[PDB]
Design a protein around this ligand. Structure first.
Ligand code: SF4
Lengths: 48, 101, 118, 226, 234, 205, 163
């Protein structure tokens, strides 16, 4: 089909110009929620 | 080979003294029950039967039931087929028609 | 000229018949997904008597990502940029089985917090 | 699968909300529960090198069937994946409840698995009806009053609510997540307190409509997975 | 002299002891059960129900291995402990007069075999073997109504069946068992609030407390909810 | 062993019920693709639920696995309603089994499930690649080409039976009858895992 | 003869009894399909419980196997109206020093399993308005063959031309 021809047309991204043994890490995620609070909705350890 | 009668066979079965149409003794389908002996009954004998093929008396040809009473012999090329009738196309079809109803 | 991939695809297609979905290619070669698209196109280009064709995902998105089953039709993706070819299937249906694969070599994008044995 | 390449740049840390494995309780036994849970382990150990995940049970996956519901560790995972939560405490994955306050240095967002509003939206409603644009505003209401939505709430033999922890809490988020609607719905409404974006992510057999959320200009982006 | 719904088999131990599948006309099918006059008193309902199902099974298809698996299933229900707990409700004439239907429910058994004939509290909140037991007097009192009424004339010993049965991931198993009886208890709460809807006007949120405070001595879901809430204290 | 005939039971469940699905001997709307019929399936195999029929199928598999060394070749026979002539004879093998050896090594759960998934997918492939004309009026029956058996006389010789396990065993020898003993034959890719050599082919007419 | 006589005579008597039940020459519920097994088979073996009729077919199969040594092509036709063609021709073709007792005893299972495969897979034209007649040689007939007896010394072609 011409779907394969679209892949034939798009030869510009040979490898996306990534090293590809380099992981480009994406996010500097903060996640302040995880450690320094009790979760109210969570169980009680003495109850469990 | 002149046969016997047509519907009056039932009357003939009444005539020698048998039940005209037999109504079945309730039977164990599983033979591990009956405490694996027909002798287990009350003060009088009830001799409760079993429709499973282990506890069946054979067909009584004349005055004798017959088995081979001999050694079964192993065969080298032999195809063995299964004897239970499978559920049909019609049974599963009517069962899936029964699911909306 | 990367036929080093192609025979490895050939056993998994033929000598046993479990389909490749993506992950066998990334396990074998650790090539790019664009390069994997090129490789699967090359396998499609150099097809000789495929038992049945693959269906592609489409790179052109328009807030839609759909596996194509109306193969002749163009299902809401009319001004199409491209397609990523994968899921080459012997069977009637496209189901693989899913398994853990080596990923420390193969992870294209790593974790924002990398896991610690601790 | 690449949008060349910006989809990876937008995507953050994986967030499921409820519905980890669909099953019905009266038809299930031991090994078919582990079949779907180990295939969930296959999925999560497949995606865990790529994207870190935050997981929550609570409507039809195993739960207390309450809004405060104990999230079940060590059962969703095979032995390959079981040792990661021992190795990494809460970073790459942790068990969180049906509500959770995910805070990105003060971008607090609330989750709901959906049952809390879906029972109101379909199961127990004879009245208050003048259907996505109707049911979108039911969880707007449930956000506004912070109130008792469901029919069997908090459902605990010991310590249900100790005058600190309402199941629909009192501290307000910037986005509430609710799940498993027929269609997609994503509006934003501003109140006198804060601004709140409405998130109704659909059930996955109802065409998915899978969503980006927040945190650049507080903007959401769905994509049709079918 | 009418015809009046003859029976295909008939159990015939005594005077005024009928039971058969009665049916008035040949065009009818699934012949009506007849329970007139029958010897099969207080009349604790489980004996009547198992005798009815046993006769229904013995009489629809004329087979006894299904009776075997049904009676063995019922002895598992008593033994392992899946008890509906309306199965045994005795009542002395201790206070015409209706100072009766007193709370006395002997399915409980005895922990230490200490209290003589004092399985009295029908809603006693404790663990498993003070709600179900195997070796007692009422296992004799449940094995005699099949044997005397039905199994005498057929000769099969249901007492031999009782003698044959009287002797003969795990945290995830406990978890999925908690899910099983949690969904069962929520279904019981659903049944109870739909039952208790007649006292609210249309409200549903206060339905839970009124559902929990229903106390019948005789209701076929209430005792299951009692043992459901007996489980949740653990 | 114990785990290996569980794998044989699941493999034969997949094989038998998949042949039942692709021959349209039961309506396809009753079938649904699944992983759980009493155990863990390797693939999603279209299985109709129909508890009499699945009782029959696990019955037949527990019959065939009961002998487990006489059988060198389990098979499935295909018979029309029109004639008793064989339409297809799907070949399976119980050759060089672990269970006859009773070797503990080796489990290789993922590897044996891998080769089972391969043989199932080959069965899928050569079950769509023959066409669909006269899609109804087909039935099912079993056949076993086995090397050294005869058990059917165990009903006889005035035996007195006491235990349910040998009640089952007498049902096993009761259910099986020796028959009296080509046109086309097509290749199928078998599983080639070490302890479980299942060299499976197909026959046409 | 030569030691196939006993299992051949019980095979024809049980074949006649199965024809009598499953094509209802007599009333279908006028039988006992419960307490008799013919060979080591699962299925029901419904012999007429009539002593005079079991003696009648006893003498029938005993005399046809008395004339076995020069017997001609065997059949059974069920007749009430004009059909004039054989229904179930289990042709007894006389062969002839092979020692086959166990194997032929197994072989009469598959003959009788082909019989029941012809019997349970068989339509219904009319209830009880038919009568059988053993004979040695319903709009339209139909051809159907069943299994052979190659393991047995005597081969039985077991044709059953229904209607
Ligand atoms: S337990 Fe009480 S409220 Fe519930 S259904 Fe029974 S009678 Fe009604």
């Amino acid at each position: 089909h011409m779907d394969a021809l679209l892949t034939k047309f798009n030869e510009d991204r040979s490898l996306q110009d990534e090293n590809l043994s380099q992981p480009r890490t994406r996010v500097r995620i903060v996640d302040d929620n995880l450690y320094n609070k009790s979760n109210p909705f969570q169980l009680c350890y003495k109850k469990r | 080979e002149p046969p016997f009668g047509y519907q009056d066979i039932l009357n003939k079965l009444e005539d020698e003294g048998f039940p005209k149409i037999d109504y079945k003794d309730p039977f164990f389908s599983n033979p591990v029950d009956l405490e694996n002996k027909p002798y287990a009954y009350a003060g009088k004998r009830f001799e409760i039967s079993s429709t499973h093929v282990s506890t069946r008396i054979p067909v009584q040809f004349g005055g004798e039931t017959v088995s081979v009473y001999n050694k079964p012999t192993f065969d080298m090329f032999s195809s063995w087929k299964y004897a239970l009738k499978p559920p049909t196309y019609d049974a599963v079809q009517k069962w899936y028609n029964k699911v909306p109803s | 000229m990367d036929q080093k991939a192609s025979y490895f695809i050939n056993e998994k297609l033929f000598t046993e018949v479990k389909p490749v979905l993506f992950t066998d290619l990334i396990h074998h070669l650790k090539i790019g997904p664009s390069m994997a698209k090129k490789l699967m196109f090359d396998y499609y280009k150099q097809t000789t008597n495929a038992k049945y064709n693959c269906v592609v995902i489409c790179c052109y998105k328009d807030q839609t990502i759909k596996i194509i089953h109306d193969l002749s039709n163009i299902p809401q993706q009319d001004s199409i940029i491209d397609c990523f070819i994968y899921a080459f299937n012997p069977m009637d249906s496209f189901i693989p089985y899913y398994d853990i694969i080596d990923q420390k070599d193969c992870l294209t994008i790593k974790n924002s917090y990398e896991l610690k044995v601790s | 699968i690449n949008n060349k390449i910006d989809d990876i740049s937008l995507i953050g840390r994986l967030l499921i909300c409820g519905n980890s494995v669909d099953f019905d309780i009266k038809s299930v036994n031991k090994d078919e529960l582990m079949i779907s849970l180990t295939e969930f382990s296959k999925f999560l150990h497949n995606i865990l090198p790529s994207i870190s995940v935050d997981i929550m049970p609570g409507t039809n996956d195993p739960s207390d069937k309450s809004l405060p519901q104990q999230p079940f560790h060590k059962s969703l995972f095979d032995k390959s994946l079981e040792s990661y939560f021992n190795g990494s405490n809460k970073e790459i994955l942790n068990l969180v409840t049906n509500p959770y306050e995910f805070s990105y240095n003060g971008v607090d967002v609330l989750a709901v698995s959906g049952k809390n509003i879906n029972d109101i939206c379909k199961y127990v409603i004879p009245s208050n009806d003048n259907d996505i644009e109707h049911r979108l505003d039911l969880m707007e209401c449930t956000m506004k009053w912070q109130n008792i939505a469901p029919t069997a709430p908090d459902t605990l033999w010991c310590y249900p609510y100790t005058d600190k922890d309402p199941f629909v809490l009192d501290k307000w988020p910037h986005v509430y997540i609710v799940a498993n609607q027929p269609y997609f719905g994503t509006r934003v409404v501003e109140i006198g307190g804060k601004n709140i974006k409405i998130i109704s992510v659909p059930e996955f057999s109802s065409t998915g409509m899978i969503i980006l959320l927040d945190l650049e200009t507080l903007e959401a982006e769905t994509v049709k997975i079918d | 002299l009418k015809f009046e719904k003859v029976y295909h088999p008939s159990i015939l131990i005594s005077k005024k002891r009928y039971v058969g599948f009665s049916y008035e006309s040949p065009s009818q099918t699934l012949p009506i059960f007849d329970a007139k006059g029958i010897e099969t008193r207080d009349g604790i309902p489980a004996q009547q129900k198992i005798i009815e199902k046993c006769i229904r099974l013995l009489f629809q298809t004329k087979d006894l291995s299904k009776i075997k698996k049904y009676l063995q299933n019922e002895f598992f229900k008593i033994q392992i402990g899946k008890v509906s707990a309306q199965d045994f409700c005795f009542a002395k004439e201790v206070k015409p007069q209706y100072k009766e239907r007193i709370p006395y429910l002997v399915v409980k058994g005895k922990q230490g075999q200490l209290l003589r004939e004092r399985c009295v509290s029908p809603e006693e909140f404790l663990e498993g073997e003070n709600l179900e037991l195997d070796s007692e007097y009422y296992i004799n009192k449940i094995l005699i109504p099949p044997l005397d009424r039905l199994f005498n004339l057929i000769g099969i010993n249901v007492g031999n069946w009782a003698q044959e049965i009287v002797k003969s991931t795990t945290t995830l198993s406990f978890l999925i068992k908690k899910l099983k009886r949690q969904k069962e208890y929520q279904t019981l709460k659903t049944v109870c609030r739909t039952c208790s809807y007649r006292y609210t006007s249309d409200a549903g949120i206060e339905n839970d407390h009124i559902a929990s405070k229903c106390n019948s001595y005789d209701c076929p879901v209430f005792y299951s909810r009692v043992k459901a809430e007996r489980y949740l204290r653990d | 062993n114990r785990w290996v005939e569980k794998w044989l039971r699941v493999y034969l469940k997949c094989y038998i019920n998949l042949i039942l699905f692709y021959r349209n001997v039961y309506p396809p709307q009753s079938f649904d693709y699944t992983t759980y019929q009493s155990f863990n399936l390797p693939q999603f195999v279209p299985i109709n639920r129909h508890p009499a029929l699945i009782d029959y199928i696990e019955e037949l598999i527990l019959d065939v696995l009961s002998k487990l060394t006489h059988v060198y070749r389990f098979s499935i026979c295909i018979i029309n309603k029109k004639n008793d002539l064989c339409i297809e004879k799907y070949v399976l093998d119980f050759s060089e089994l672990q269970h006859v050896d009773k070797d503990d090594q080796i489990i290789t759960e993922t590897e044996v499930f891998d080769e089972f998934r391969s043989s199932l997918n080959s069965l899928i492939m050569h079950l769509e690649k023959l066409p669909k004309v006269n899609d109804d009026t087909i039935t099912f029956e079993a056949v076993i080409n086995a090397i050294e058996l005869e058990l059917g006389h165990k009903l006889d010789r005035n035996r007195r039976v006491d235990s349910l396990e040998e009640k089952a065993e007498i049902e096993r020898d009761s259910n099986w009858v020796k028959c009296q003993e080509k046109i086309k034959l097509t290749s199928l890719v078998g599983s080639d895992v070490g302890p479980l050599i299942i060299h499976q082919f197909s026959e046409k007419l």
